[PDB]
Amino acid sequence: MGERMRAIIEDYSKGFGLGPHGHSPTHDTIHYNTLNAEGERVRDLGYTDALGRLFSEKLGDRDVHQWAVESCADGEADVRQLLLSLHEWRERGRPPSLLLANVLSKYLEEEIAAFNKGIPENAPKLQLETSDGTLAHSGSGGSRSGTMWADVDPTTFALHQASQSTRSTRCDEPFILHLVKRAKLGECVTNFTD
């Protein structure tokens, strides 16, 4: 039962196509991910925007929805739209729609001007400009948001930024009780299946 299981799993999970070294994962003499060399390379880099944390810093504590009713006067833009796009940008890390980019630009302008204030001449700046049609941030040079990546698959990004405790848990419980439990029991309370 076990061997059949393993066979199926190894077959469905096998990679294909060509990797960064130009060869398949099954190539005879030349290899990929030696001793989890890529795993560590992701460990120490992390997937995040600079724009992401500038925003999450300025906004700070206060209500996402509140801010989204603020940033729109009655006539600016549909709240549903920029709410959608914000959600898809923060978790499930994506390139921000030019809607969200315009809003953010006229919101964060002082923090971006402050992050851009000391930079030497030949070094990468941080700029939100949609002058070119496409949003894929492999297109801008990664200089549009603060992203170091061309693409990160949504699920993994979400696990990463949620592994950051700054990501806000719902806590429908009594607050102090919630925090006390988190301190005393730790996260090792789920070590137990009972």
Partner: peptide, 11 residues
């Protein structure tokens, strides 16, 4: 103490 046990925390 009732409050400390019952309070939600954002405002």
């Amino acid at each position: 103490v009732s409050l400390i046990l019952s309070w939600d925390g954002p405002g």
